[PDB]
Amino acid sequence: AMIRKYRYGAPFDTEALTEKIETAEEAFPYGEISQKEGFAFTYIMDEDDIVYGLGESNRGINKRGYCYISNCTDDPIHTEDKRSLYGAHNFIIVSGKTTFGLFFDYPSKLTFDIGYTRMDTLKVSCENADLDIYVIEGENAYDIVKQFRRVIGRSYIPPKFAFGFGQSRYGYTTKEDFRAVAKGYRENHIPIDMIYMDIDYMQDFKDFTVNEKNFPDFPEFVKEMKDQELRLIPIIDAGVKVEKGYEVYEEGVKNNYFCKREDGSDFVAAVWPGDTHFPDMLNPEARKWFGDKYRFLIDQGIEGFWNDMNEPAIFYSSEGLAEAKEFAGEFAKDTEGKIHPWAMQAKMKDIVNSPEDYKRFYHNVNGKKIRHDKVHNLFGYNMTRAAGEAFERIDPEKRFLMFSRSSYIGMHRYGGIWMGDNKSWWSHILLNLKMLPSLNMCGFMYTGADLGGFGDDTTRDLLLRFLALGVFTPLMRDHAAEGTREQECYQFENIEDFRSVINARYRLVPYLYSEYMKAALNDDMYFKPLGFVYPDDKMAIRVEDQLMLGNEIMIAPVYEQNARGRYVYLPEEMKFIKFMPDGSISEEVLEKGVHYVDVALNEVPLFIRSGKCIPVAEAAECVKDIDTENMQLIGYEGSSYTLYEDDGIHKDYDKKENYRVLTK
Amino acid sequence: NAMIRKYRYGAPFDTEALTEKIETAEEAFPYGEISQKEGFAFTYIMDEDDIVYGLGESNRGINKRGYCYISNCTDDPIHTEDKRSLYGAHNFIIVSGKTTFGLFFDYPSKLTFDIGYTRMDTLKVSCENADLDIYVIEGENAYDIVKQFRRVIGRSYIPPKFAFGFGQSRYGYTTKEDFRAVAKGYRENHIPIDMIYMDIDYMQDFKDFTVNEKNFPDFPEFVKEMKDQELRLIPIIDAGVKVEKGYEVYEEGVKNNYFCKREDGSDFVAAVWPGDTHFPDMLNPEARKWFGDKYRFLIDQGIEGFWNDMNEPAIFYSSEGLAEAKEFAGEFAKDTEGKIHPWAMQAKMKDIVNSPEDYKRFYHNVNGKKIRHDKVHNLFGYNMTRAAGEAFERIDPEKRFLMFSRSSYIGMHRYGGIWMGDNKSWWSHILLNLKMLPSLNMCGFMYTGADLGGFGDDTTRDLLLRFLALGVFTPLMRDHAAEGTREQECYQFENIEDFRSVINARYRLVPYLYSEYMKAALNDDMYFKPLGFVYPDDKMAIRVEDQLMLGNEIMIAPVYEQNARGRYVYLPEEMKFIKFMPDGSISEEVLEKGVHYVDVALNEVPLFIRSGKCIPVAEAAECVKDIDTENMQLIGYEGSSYTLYEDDGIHKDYDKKENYRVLTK
Ligand SMILES: C[C@H]1O[C@H](O[C@H]2[C@H](O)[C@@H](O)[C@@H](O[C@H]3[C@H](O)[C@@H](O)[C@@H](O)O[C@@H]3CO)O[C@@H]2CO)[C@H](O)[C@@H](O)[C@@H]1N[C@H]1C=C(CO)[C@@H](O)[C@H](O)[C@H]1O
Ligand SMILES: C[C@H]1O[C@H](O[C@H]2[C@H](O)[C@@H](O)[C@@H](O[C@H]3[C@H](O)[C@@H](O)[C@@H](O)O[C@@H]3CO)O[C@@H]2CO)[C@H](O)[C@@H](O)[C@@H]1N[C@H]1C=C(CO)[C@@H](O)[C@H](O)[C@H]1O
């Protein structure tokens, strides 16, 4: 009713939406649509108009003033200029005097020119007038989003343990590597529930093996780790290594489960294991075959997975590789200097994630051959769907921890997202923050960034400020790239400081989980821009470095080096809370308005809204040990918090026992 | 100045950074601990509250704690927070806390500042060779310590007045049409401007000290076509002298042994824009004078300023590097077994650029003894600008020339300014350009700016405007853009009157800004100051990093977040919030000491006036020579006094009672 679906050409069915919406028949309600060059929507914006959405895209909460292209790209350098990151989330809302939401249900490259060309002009275009546009209406932007959240289906719900802290590093390889990490944390009493395993745990980077030489009995090691409440979260890449004898490879080939070239042969793309093949994620059968392979690890005790390189990322195809070796040929023999080293360098770079490669292989969809570039942004989506759907067969009642890098809307039902290869820059603390709400609008609630920065060298302080933001993000893990400064918490001085920050995560767990469960089950938001909560405050709607969490709190982390505080705007009176390093909790009332607050490196800050309160537990070293019984209530006297909780393992969501009102 | 003990280690190369002879102190080192096991290392444990200023043009913020900085002039077009080395080497730092003192490491080689990077409480300055002078500057506070240092390094370079105008630039402008188009585009729209820069294209095949003969049949006249319009062309000069027979500059450098040379006596070859080039031996006096004198060519044609580029010096690849690369390309090409990953190929291409190894392959002839370049690496750009400067004074001693350089070392500030190089059209770079200001001032470099709009990548309308609004206050205010970037000339955007509004604020402030720069340079004082220097005992002010004091009257606080309509500020004393309005009016508002949010729209230029002060504001003019300083509105507080310095802005006659006049509100 307050949602209509306008249809152009013959759209590919993305299965993005779970709710049926009939094809409206009147005139498109806003702006203009054109077909002189492919397809274009053009809209003129009110000078005060704010644009939200685009989920995991570059820049800030208000998208006005730059260009975003949905075109899932493996790009390790997230600088302000980049137009396409990992995600393809074609949902925007124009909010102002004239407010409306738009979802562009489209598989391929979609360019959102949001004021970049002309300031007052919003122009969303793509090569093909074959798509569905969904127009949503409501009073405010929050209401437009909650409607969207309805029609795309309930977001993924992770197991309770995933609301713990997780340690990860590209490099962990042996039982020793892993033990010294468990050692490092448990011996210094720093809580943690997860350690991630990156590609070095496989045999020759073969999907669905383990290095038999390093884990002669992987299952027992898993049980040894799990005994200390450490759950090993293995990675899975998109490419299956080409290698005779390799079971997963032989099957893929024999049953035509792989993407093929225009000639029927299996397309080769090179990744970690060298030459690989990509499972045909768009083909229902291949998807059940791929998903089922997760049993290999589940049967061994594994309760979580992360999907990577699933744009899919291509270092080089056999086609590109020959072009390059060949060019290098003329370079090597160049006497006249007709071939500059810059160009040789340019070719090496162009064979990576080549657009030419993305038209070299095809998907087989219920018998229809479709070229990959045409459906490019669905690949990661469906790889994560394969896992999810396979999960539900293996054990319909159990929750598995699951996240992916690349995604498209609809994938939000089967798994969360991590924000990819960030760097150890202070600006990336803010980027982590700004992306949260957008992702929530698009259904992705279980998200977080690599704390302390994936790439490059971190410092003791960058890490602590990153963690302090992580405290509030459902996914909280410290991750680091190959050969960077070691950034485990125990790899610094005065380690107790890190204990302090993590401790705060582990006291806030029952609240954060609660607020998560309530949001997901209600097709609602976990993180909200201040604009959603105080739509009348023309000051609040412009704030981009503070977020509302649930209905009880606001967060505002420090993201500047050497700072000892930061400016905040409070659209209402709140109590200002800091989790102190001695184990106590500072509390101060602060009137609405502007304020500079003092927040030391080893203190964690949050605000509690007027007439509200939240439960806080004692610090425990793992999710299982948190005493949920006698929690302290912080906030406003006479207020009440409805606390959700369940076994945090199965999907028994609708019990009256799951709710329990607390009054301060 | 015997409040500046100097400590000697080894047999230091003389950088000529100081103009003041300081004797070699004789006691143990006044602070921390010195070690000499595997080179040289100063190690100091800092107090928790200590702040660290300095390092001029270096990465990150005002307070330098919490990272690692390396003096090693490097051509790096990507200015991300992780970078440890950019273009300049300004080895001056100051520890500001319970124990305040200042340090200058006079060392021309790779010098590492580990400022609380490894251990948070640990400052460690180390290098390979113990061949260095270390100046310890004692004093009451940081500001004072900086004033001392400014005096032993000598008066800062002083630009002609026309350089406080606005300038337009692009790695693209090639023909008369292009330049005329910039002319017409600005003039027709009554947008103030004084300079148009000429990038490497005006040359004859990138040959230094030539001009394109087909492009510019009669250059002196075209230069005149522009000058009559109050537009001054500022051509670039590159470090590399193109290798080519018949090319006079090359023939002479070779004939007279003026180029840097391989170990074996051969003229070292480095590839740059022109192709193979030689580098003029900037550490050789005869060479330095020969190169400097070459500027006459352009000066005798009516040119009144220059910029020196690529002078780290930047190297695309050496002859040795190309060969090594082509031979690797071969192995890769014929490799049938996948022995050679494409990543290794790609890594080799990257390796040949600015290859530390090349910097080991050429020497400087310093009156007799040959010195391997890497041993004096941070000096190259400094002595190239020194070549140009000394030349100017031989060529015409009365007249001031516009001069600035990319690479630099303390001491170069006497001969020219610098721009902050290849930044990017990122909002974060507006702040980066802000934060570098104070630091560069502490090291003598006052004439500085950044590429407004962002050099690299594509800018937007709002980004360019917020950049200009900072640029209003930086002595170098220049719009420059990379090859193939979106056009960022002010006339290439809708509602052009918002660019005329903003750049009006500049020309209206020019009388006062010029005044402060002149006063500051002649007094060995700073033009920009961190708030700590002015409000030493306000714990809140000593940590403000995104505001700056300018002279002794005003404070700046640029908007740097995209889509923001205001920003938070902290005021250490009562002040008049002022906005140059898009209508021409100047809004005024008193705000007390404390935190505030102030509305600054895109097309408004903000600034604050200190309690007890005021400033002159002229009416808008479209070029510097047309500005009317006779009757200027005074903006500020009642019964305050401003001393206006002014002169002909052309010659070098600075010490005269007639240059000053007291204005009273
Ligand atoms: C691990 C990471 O590797 C791949 O990306 C890397 C590039 O291939 C490298 O060339 C290198 O690029 C840097 C260059 O040296 C230089 O141009 C500099 O300016 O910066 C560049 C980027 O920092 O570094 C890249 C990233 O470190 C691949 O594209 C990327 O997606 C990979 N990340 C995934 C893989 C692993 C291992 O399974 C996980 O640890 C990550 O979390 C994944 O997201
Ligand atoms: C003009 C500029 O060119 C040289 O640097 C360029 C590189 O050679 C290119 O490879 C390219 O780098 C980009 C990467 O491919 C990409 O990874 C992305 O991250 O951005 C990189 C840089 O934006 O672009 C570079 C910049 O164009 C040279 O080393 C550099 O120092 C040059 N700058 C000076 C030269 C000119 C022309 O005479 C002047 O206009 C400038 O103002 C100078 O500062």
Interaxial angle between packed helices A284-292 and A247-254, expressed in degrees from 0 to 180 and rounded to the nearest 10 = 170
A621 lines ligand 1 (CB under 6 A): no
Residue count of chain B, please give it. 665
Count other C-beta atoms under 10 Å from residue A183's C-beta: 12
CATH number of B156-538: 3.20.20.80
Q: Separation of A245 CA from ligand 2 center, angstroms?
A: 48
> CA of B48: which chain A residue's CA is closest?
A562
Q: DSSP H helical segments within A115-162, as ranges?
A: 141-152
Q: Which two tokens stand for residue B452?
A: 């407004």
Strand partners, B663: B642
Give the strand pairing for A416-418 and A447-448.
Answer: parallel
Closest CA to A382 of A444, A449, A312, A320: A312
In the numeric block, the tokens 């006459």 are attached to B296
Nearest chain B CA: its distance from A487 CA (Å) = 12
User: Atom 10 (ligand 1): residue with closest C-alpha?
Assistant: B343
Which listed ligand is nearest to A406 at the C-alpha?
1
Nearest chain A CA: its distance from B172 CA (Å) = 19
Which SS3 state, helix, strand or coil, does residue B207 take?
A: strand
User: What does the alpha-carbon distance between residue A660 and residue A517 come to, in Å, rounded to a whole number?
Assistant: 13
Q: Separation of B77 CA from ligand 2 center, angstroms?
A: 5
| Residue A445: partners with Cβ closer than 8 Å, 6 or more residues away | A155, A156, A412, A416, A439, A474, A516, A519, A520, A525, A526
- By most ligand atoms within 8 Å of CB, the mutation choice from B79, B343, B348, B354 for ligand 1 is B343
Closest CA to A642 of A624, A623, A621, A656: A656
B426 secondary structure, DSSP code? -
CATH architecture of the domain with range B539-665: Sandwich (2.60)
> CA of A596: which chain B residue's CA is closest?
B595
Nearest chain B CA: its distance from A206 CA (Å) = 19
Q: Separation of B75 CA from ligand 2 center, angstroms?
A: 9
Asked if residues A526 and A549 have their Cβ atoms less than 8 Å apart, the reply is yes
User: What does the alpha-carbon distance between residue A553 and residue A515 come to, in Å, rounded to a whole number?
Assistant: 11
Query: Which value in Å is the resolution of this experimental model?
Result: 2.2
Question: Please, what sign has the CA dihedral across residues B369, B374, B376, B377?
Answer: positive
User: What does the alpha-carbon distance between residue B377 and residue B89 come to, in Å, rounded to a whole number?
Assistant: 10
Asked if residues B72 and B378 have their Cβ atoms less than 8 Å apart, the reply is yes
Question: Please, what sign has the CA dihedral across residues B544, B550, B556, B562?
Answer: negative
Which listed ligand is nearest to B420 at the C-alpha?
2
Asked if residues A46 and A96 have their Cβ atoms less than 8 Å apart, the reply is yes
Asked if residues B528 and B438 have their Cβ atoms less than 8 Å apart, the reply is yes
Which listed ligand is nearest to B271 at the C-alpha?
2
In the numeric block, the tokens 């080293």 are attached to A341
Asked if residues A235 and A306 have their Cβ atoms less than 8 Å apart, the reply is yes
Q: What are phi and psi of A505, to 5 degrees?
A: -60, -40
Closest CA to B353 of B385, B310, B293: B310
Ramachandran region, residue A456 (left: φ > 0; alpha: ψ -120 to 50; beta: rest): left
Which CATH number does the domain A155-537 belong to among 1.10.1040.50, 2.40.30.10, 3.20.20.80, 3.40.50.2300? 3.20.20.80
Q: Which two tokens stand for residue A476?
A: 């909280």
Asked if residues A421 and A480 have their Cβ atoms less than 8 Å apart, the reply is no
A75 lines ligand 1 (CB under 6 A): no
Asked if residues A317 and A352 have their Cβ atoms less than 8 Å apart, the reply is no
Which SS3 state, helix, strand or coil, does residue A183 take?
A: helix
Closest CA to B122 of B130, B109, B113: B113
Q: Which two tokens stand for residue A14?
A: 């993305």
In the numeric block, the tokens 């392979």 are attached to A293
Q: Which helix (H) or strand (E) holds B388?
A: helix B380-395
Asked whether the beta carbons of residue B325 and residue A341 sit closer than 8 angstroms, the reply is: yes
Which SS3 state, helix, strand or coil, does residue A142 take?
A: helix
CATH architecture of the domain with range B1-155: Sandwich (2.60)
Give the strand pairing for A131-136 and A100-105.
Answer: antiparallel
User: What does the alpha-carbon distance between residue B516 and residue A269 come to, in Å, rounded to a whole number?
Assistant: 62
Asked if residues A57 and A87 have their Cβ atoms less than 8 Å apart, the reply is yes
Using an 8 Å CB-CB cutoff, list chain A residues near B327.
332
Q: What are phi and psi of B142, to 5 degrees?
A: -60, -60
User: What does the alpha-carbon distance between residue B25 and residue B525 come to, in Å, rounded to a whole number?
Assistant: 27
User: Atom 25 (ligand 1): residue with closest C-alpha?
Assistant: A76
- By most ligand atoms within 8 Å of CB, the mutation choice from B86, B200, B422 for ligand 2 is B422
Q: Separation of B59 CA from ligand 2 center, angstroms?
A: 18
User: What does the alpha-carbon distance between residue B279 and residue B240 come to, in Å, rounded to a whole number?
Assistant: 5
A455 lines ligand 1 (CB under 6 A): yes
Q: How far is CA B193 from the centre of its chain?
A: 21
Nearest CB to B462; choose among A65, A331, A341 = A65
User: What does the alpha-carbon distance between residue A618 and residue A498 come to, in Å, rounded to a whole number?
Assistant: 16
User: What does the alpha-carbon distance between residue B543 and residue B536 come to, in Å, rounded to a whole number?
Assistant: 10
Asked if residues A125 and A40 have their Cβ atoms less than 8 Å apart, the reply is yes
Asked whether the beta carbons of residue A596 and residue B462 sit closer than 8 angstroms, the reply is: no
Q: How far is CA A333 from the centre of its chain?
A: 47
Domain ranges for chain A: 1-154, 155-537, 538-664
User: What does the alpha-carbon distance between residue B594 and residue B612 come to, in Å, rounded to a whole number?
Assistant: 17
Check if B1-155 and B539-665 are the same fold: yes
User: What does the alpha-carbon distance between residue B51 and residue B65 come to, in Å, rounded to a whole number?
Assistant: 7
Give the strand pairing for A477-478 and A166-167.
Answer: parallel
Asked whether the beta carbons of residue B543 and residue A563 sit closer than 8 angstroms, the reply is: yes
User: What does the alpha-carbon distance between residue A458 and residue B496 come to, in Å, rounded to a whole number?
Assistant: 43
Q: Which helix (H) or strand (E) holds A465?
A: helix A460-470
Asked whether the beta carbons of residue B342 and residue A459 sit closer than 8 angstroms, the reply is: no
Using an 8 Å CB-CB cutoff, list chain A residues near B61.
561-562
DSSP letter for each residue of A332-375: HT-SS--S-HHHHHHHHHHTTT-TTGGGT-EEEETTEEEEHHHH
CATH architecture of the domain with range A1-154: Sandwich (2.60)
Count other C-beta atoms under 10 Å from residue A285's C-beta: 13
A140 secondary structure, DSSP code? S
CB pairs below 8 Å between A and B: how many?
Answer: 145
Give the strand pairing for A316-317 and A274-277.
Answer: unpaired
Q: Separation of A204 CA from ligand 1 center, angstroms?
A: 19
List the end-to-end C-alpha distance of chain B, in Å, as a whole number. Answer: 39
Closest CA to A378 of A258, A486, A282: A282
CATH number of A538-664: 2.60.40.4040
Nearest CB to B117; choose among A115, A332, A459 = A459
What technique was this entry resolved by?
A: X-ray
Q: Work out the angle at residue A71's Cα, subtended by the Cα atoms of residues A68 and A75, and round it to the nearest 5 degrees.
A: 90
Q: Which two tokens stand for residue B72?
A: 């090693």
Using an 8 Å CB-CB cutoff, list chain B residues near A462.
66
Q: Which atom of ligand 1 is nearest to the CA of A450?
A: 42
Asked whether the beta carbons of residue A345 and residue B342 sit closer than 8 angstroms, the reply is: no
Asked whether the beta carbons of residue B81 and residue A274 sit closer than 8 angstroms, the reply is: no
